[PDB]
Amino acid sequence: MGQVVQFKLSDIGEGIREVTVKEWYVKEGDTVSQFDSICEVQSDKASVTITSRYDGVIKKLYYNLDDIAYVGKPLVDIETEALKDLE
């Protein structure tokens, strides 16, 4: 209690092509829900979608449906219940 979990582009390797967001359903300072996913990226390989499984608070967002995210650096910070996903 008192910490936020950050999402980092990891759909690809840490030294290859990057990927952009295909579906965005959140905004800076906005809250997420179990049905309201944060971001979703789609690559020729497979379609990735980031769910929440709970209602979390999103404070800042930099990459949009058009911006490409790179592996190795976080993308957005959101507050969600303890999830093994990142911790």
Closest CA to 31 of 84, 76, 70, 85: 76
The Cα-based distances of 10 to 40, 49, 55, 73 in angstroms read 12, 12, 22, 9
Q: How is the chain split into domains, by residue range?
A: 1-87
Closest CA to 42 of 14, 23, 69: 23
The tokens of 24 are what? 């965005």
The tokens of 26 are what? 């959140």
1-87 CATH fold = OB fold (Dihydrolipoamide Acetyltransferase, E2P) (2.40.50)
